[PDB]
Ligand binder design. Structure first.
Ligand SMILES: Nc1nc2c(ncn2[C@@H]2O[C@H](COP(=O)(O)OP(=O)(O)O)[C@@H](OP(=O)(O)OP(=O)(O)O)[C@H]2O)c(=O)[nH]1
Ligand SMILES: Nc1nc2c(ncn2[C@@H]2O[C@H](COP(=O)(O)OP(=O)(O)O)[C@@H](OP(=O)(O)OP(=O)(O)O)[C@H]2O)c(=O)[nH]1
Lengths: 711, 711, 239
């Protein structure tokens, strides 16, 4: 934070010379001094440089051209306004939030003015920093405790060791010194929710629209379990999204509960859709309780909102309709929903309290905001028993939390506060929409096939576009209306190969091939299905990254159409098996994999495998207890009908749980087995395109086994 | 790592001028040159500066004076040896580990030699760095993945925000870029135990004497639960140290198990002693199983080794005697035991496999080695079902681990490896012993009272000194021999106030007053009891911190004997309650508090409180289930006899569990209540010396309540 | 390969100052920075100077005027394109072979951008160098074999002799160190057609429109005899 802008040629030495003097005085204080040419140049400087922390200008010349524009960008940004005898305040300024200091033009005043600017810069810094992080930085600057844990004592133990010195030097002093413990009494305590930690939690709850917020330092994996353990006593029944993260399987394995699954929909691409509205109705649930051994009325429900591919629920509908006293939205993918009105009514915290219910979001701050790995938040709307909730929190929280992770969780909130926060989120939405429109444009303009974007036929509006039953784009048959919405920032691209019907085209380019090409060019694909690719247009992704991705896609098409050798176009793939890929061309690879997909009927098998559930013979908890007693064995995948599965089976595609521990494939659920067998067969053909089923094990002879409970 | 030492005046220009040329060439490559005066000056430079990464010298003049001494300090340290025509290799060098390059004295060769030195320095760095940390640092320098989580994208996202830029600037680019995910495929995966992660685990197991080691990123709080949950299925019985960390109480609250408690001893100071040898013998356990409802033969045993105050067990005895197939040493306080022979036979991993048993250590690498907060290791000796063990591991491990914490765990191993590592731990043992001897010396030399050290009458040997039944220093009655040992690095200081009999002295200085004094001077007291203070002489604590502590203790005596005003001697205490402390002097404070301890009979009540056990009415798991159903209420502490406790009650002193959830104080265990009532009374008198009982709540009228289950 | 061209007057400090900063950061990495007046000046600079290895320019201002013309001269030439908020890719670029990195105008970003340019320059060099030559140059920079023929050992033996030192100094270190033998096993072998030598032969064959190519080190005088002796056994007739 050291860049000061000076805006001006004034034509009078009595103004210009004191400004030259101020330039020199500011440089002596280690500011860097920048000179925009005009009003628009200055606004671009502010917009492009977060470290620009002050603006010097002639008041009469510029106030009516600058003040309103600046206030929209940054409420808090120091203005250093130089006054004329008759300078005054226009009524248009009355309601603007501005930080203004007024100065005179005088020779010899520069040193004093520079000192005031320095002081006002520190006040700005202290205004924008949140409380715990501010306290942590101050401690690192000023503090001096010894005989403390961490045993490394601000990195001291590292410096006495050759390898330790490399480690210390890599991370640097501030990182090492900020790794502290509750011995630093002035920072309070995470587990006690005291001092600056209490201030951080209250600060976060305000920013994120929660009644109460908890900082978790072991990821949403852990936040999910804290919420679940508080919410679901032994002997109870819970409703759980079949599209649930593995941490919720772990919760079920650790807690003696009976699950009843919400059943999401899916399209022909293998993309998950929303749990239909009928799944939330009392009659539906009551009947499933009746049909489930040992089930009672659910005390807790867990819903994944949004889906991975960006489908958000009408959460107003869910909260009004779902007659369960505790509703937890696993919101790991959507930590930013409070920061744009486009997400209103589409996130757990939206709106107010619900009578007789507590609502939660868990969020992975590190995924789609800016925070260190393992940073997570629990947001609560409604009443909890605070002591009992804290026991559950403490059961999963270390006694030695990492303060960097904690500070980063609080600073993520600070970043999202106000106009600078709204602008960060708006910008990610705008850039996602810009890129979405570019794909559609290039699809029209290019010669022959192109990528498509999975979205409405027109996106002339900035909103989470509703999925409507009268539109074919989303692929979900007979969808509920006013139920699901597409998050603009979750951009799904489609490769040729499937028709509007959900039927197969003659020409196809399996998305795995495009992903391989992108990885050559350092672009990671978050998620891939047979003909789909997901890109997260997060606040991380700037215009430069968006352009690089767009250019890589036009280059894929250009190179594909030239039919380059695999050896040249996909060197990393070639290196996996040069002899196999020596003479193969890209169009041949695409054709062959596509024909495999078609021949094996993969999309239809994948649809049918997930449309029926395996039978719950025992709960995940009960199955794991069996495993703990050594009562598992391996059988060939082919032999698993009528056996109780020990491990979750999670195939890619489509990357969601297929079989839970304690479930059995029966005749009712035979397509589960056939899908798994097909994945094993199709994966045996192309090096680099191997079968990937978590819970299935390739044997030396190329058959797969799975782990089942002993009879 | 950029300091190169040149050792010499040779008296011939043909040698001196090329070395002048090399000095310049090396400065151009950004090395610092240093010029020791002689052999001993060079060795001190190496001893004091881990970043000294090369030594240049005339081979004939120095090799017989340097090579052996250097090899004893650093096996790997590059030597750049300048040879004469007749230079040869002495037979004494044959078995030394040395890294030597031979060079000639020639004008114009310096640029080439300097380039070879640069290359050799990089090889040295690559030799000493462990595999995962090396890969991480290399990725940071060279990698270029975009469209990646963490969403901050090497800190990118922070730089677009004013407050974010401050956070980025504080931690720095390396810290930000090293926060990565499994998208960086060349680093493999923690959860899959693959690539450099697998290399890290094997490297660690080798360094720490384990068959298998796991890196945990949520502290030993979590490592304890991973081991416990693998080891103790629902319905089972476990043997658990009554001196158990809260994480083990949480384990019992989360797992449907029945505890039987090992019963530690204690002394009149309130310092915990070891579980007696009789507690481990078959007939003792069999009888307890018979007397405990629902108990069966224990499948798993948990022992805290060492105690907080440094008492280590004869673990050879435990392993031979304890007829339980799974024995877990919670070794959070002693992660360094594999690095000095003084700990052989006194730690979990010591020795070889135990037939028919699996042995664990869990260790908080961040407490007494050098690693980031939350870094923990599980060490296994014996067979586990690797796949079931991994499920329990994954159940408590995030899907987005913090790679800094992971790299710090592996680097802690790299630091402890070999001669560098033996020297580090030897150093800390030597310093602890030096300081112990200094207290004994000052006690003799000083005028009137002084501190004492809780240790044997003679410590003229470097070992973990055995506690003997024929010695009275440790205060334990009828102790088993060849059973408990005192770790040199855990230094307990005693303040005046108790006689050798365990009776009270007329003159006392409660240790709490000394702790408040030390805290004024930025010295943290790890643990305090009525008349004891614990200091950890970790590899953090250098000679400078040891002298600062010794001086602070002499200053405490000096200022105490002058009888300074509390206002002047303890200003932070004074500003607690200025009006209360306005005229009080230090000796009066010490006297008054000591008289209170004496009047209330605190040591006798504390001893008796912990010698009986509350009655286990239900297991902690069953008690927590009741709390989860809302079935708790608050009663006054005075009315708790015959009530089932909902919370753990943990009083300070002596800082170990007194009552577990599910336990009830009866007439048989009334001393528990008497002790707690006394702590409440004694704590009402002096601001800053308040009652501290976890599980008891001070009401506005000064009465205390506890949480119990509803009748 | 160390000349970088910057093309421009933009009229806004928010763009010009970051480019000034980038100038300085690049000179610190030992690049030389040239400033063409306009599009045609830049194209002449590229045409006349093979060691011009990168071009920095404002994307919007120049992409439609530069990208096709550059792709006609050099497929592989690094372009460092500075983007505006609304910068996009014209359909006319689709089939051009371009190497483009996109950057933002920001104060204090120059050190990072200059390092990325350095990296891209090394990637460009490694793209255009063929496999054996690239391996040879890397060995000279990095290798350390001893007890090696040629007996001169990277020119070492020459430096011990007054006349030898003159010979070494004339040809220079790279020439002397690149005179190696099959002892440098990572370069494979000409006679075995192995390793980078096999890659060189296949590279050559493709460039020259051959099924197979052989590298001969004793002139076409010798290449003629190799072909001839394989082709014409004793007692045969040749045209
Ligand atoms: N403190 C302060 N606030 C002002 C001022 N002028 C406008 N505001 C706005 O008012 C908010 C404080 O509103 P209050 O009514 O005082 O607080 P409350 O909403 O928590 O009850 C600030 O929100 P915020 O918490 O700063 O964050 P955000 O909502 O702007 O992101 C800020 O947006 C001012 O002069 N001082
Ligand atoms: N690589 C290598 N090792 C040598 C050499 N000379 C002695 N050593 C020592 O030998 C150890 C390796 O012993 P091995 O028999 O190869 O491996 P093992 O102990 O794992 O079976 C090294 O231990 P370490 O794992 O490096 O650590 P530490 O035991 O010294 O702490 C090091 O102490 C050598 O020339 N090269």
């Amino acid at each position: 934070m050291n860049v000061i802008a000076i805006l001006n040629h004034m034509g009078v030495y009595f103004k210009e010379e004191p400004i030259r003097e101020l330039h020199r005085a500011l440089e002596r204080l280690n500011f860097q001094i920048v000179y925009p040419n005009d009003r628009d140049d200055l606004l671009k400087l502010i917009e492009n440089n977060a470290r620009l922390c002050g603006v010097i200008f002639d008041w009469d010349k510029y106030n009516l051209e600058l003040c309103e524009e600046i206030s929209k960008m940054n409420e808090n940004l120091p203005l250093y306004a130089f006054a004329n005898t008759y300078s005054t305040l226009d009524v248009s300024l009355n309601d603007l939030r501005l930080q203004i200091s007024f100065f005179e033009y005088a020779l010899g005043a520069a040193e004093d003015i520079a000192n005031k600017i320095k002081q006002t810069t520190d006040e700005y810094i202290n205004t924008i920093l949140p409380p715990l992080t501010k306290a942590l930085f101050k401690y690192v600057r000023e503090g001096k405790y010894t005989f403390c844990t961490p045993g490394h004592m601000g990195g001291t133990a590292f410096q006495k060791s050759p390898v330790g010195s490399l480690f210390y030097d890599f991370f640097g002093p501030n990182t090492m010194k900020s790794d502290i413990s509750i011995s630093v009494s002035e920072l309070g305590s995470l587990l006690d929710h005291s001092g600056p930690h209490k201030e951080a939690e209250q600060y976060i709850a305000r920013v994120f629209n929660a009644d109460r917020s908890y900082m978790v330092t072991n990821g949403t994996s852990t936040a999910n379990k804290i919420v679940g353990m508080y919410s679901a006593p032994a002997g109870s029944t819970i409703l759980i999204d079949r599209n649930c993260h593995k941490s919720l399987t772990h919760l079920m394995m650790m807690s003696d509960v009976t699950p009843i699954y919400f059943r999401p929909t899916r399209n022909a691409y293998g993309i998950l859709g929303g749990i239909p509205q009928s799944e939330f109705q009392h009659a539906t649930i009551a009947k499933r309780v009746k049909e489930t051994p040992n089930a009672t009325w659910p005390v807790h429900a867990v819903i994944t909102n949004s889906t991975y591919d960006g489908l958000l629920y009408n959460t107003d509908f869910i909260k009004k309709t779902l007659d369960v006293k505790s509703i937890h939205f696993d919101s790991a993918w959507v930590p930013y929903t409070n920061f744009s009105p486009i997400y209103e009514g589409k996130c757990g915290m939206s709106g107010g309290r619900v009578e007789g219910k507590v609502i939660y979001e868990t969020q992975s701050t590190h995924k789609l905001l800016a925070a260190f790995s393992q940073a997570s938040m629990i947001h609560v709307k409604g009443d909890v028993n605070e002591e009992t909730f804290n026991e559950a929190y403490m059961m999963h929280t270390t006694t030695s939390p990492h303060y960097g992770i904690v500070a980063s969780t609080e600073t993520a909130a600070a970043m999202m506060k106000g106009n600078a926060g709204k602008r960060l989120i708006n910008g990610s939405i705008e850039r996602a929409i810009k890129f979405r429109k570019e794909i559609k444009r290039l699809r029209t303009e290019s010669d022959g096939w192109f990528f498509d974007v999975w979205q409405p036929d027109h996106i002339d509006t900035t909103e989470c576009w509703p999925l409507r039953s009268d539109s074919t784009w989303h692929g979900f048959k007979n969808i509920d209306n006013e139920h699901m919405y597409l998050d603009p920032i979750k951009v799904t691209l489609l490769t040729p190969g499937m028709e509007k019907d959900g039927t197969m085209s003659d020409f196809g380019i399996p998305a795995s091939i495009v992903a391989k090409y992108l990885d050559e060019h350092g672009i990671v694909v978050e998620k891939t299905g047979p003909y789909n690719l997901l890109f997260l247009f997060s606040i991380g992704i700037d215009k430069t990254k968006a352009l690089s991705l767009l250019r890589a896609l036009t280059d894929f098409k250009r190179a594909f159409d030239l039919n380059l050798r695999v050896k040249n176009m996909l060197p990393s793939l070639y290196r996996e098996d040069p002899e196999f890929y020596e003479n193969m061309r890209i169009q041949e690879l695409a054709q062959n994999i596509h024909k495999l997909i078609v021949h094996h009927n993969l999309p239809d098998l994948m649809y049918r495998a997930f449309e029926v559930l395996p039978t719950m013979v025992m709960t995940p908890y009960a199955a794991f207890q069996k495993e703990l007693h050594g009562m598992t064995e391996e059988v060939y995948l082919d032999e698993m009908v009528g056996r109780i599965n020990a491990n979750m089976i999670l195939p890619y595609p489509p990357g969601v749980p297929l079989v839970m521990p304690g479930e059995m494939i029966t005749e009712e659920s035979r397509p589960v087995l056939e899908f798994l067998q097909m994945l094993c067969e199709i994966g045996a053909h192309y090096p680099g395109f191997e079968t990937d089923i978590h819970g299935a094990y390739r044997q030396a002879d190329g058959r797969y086994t799975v782990k089942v409970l002993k009879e």
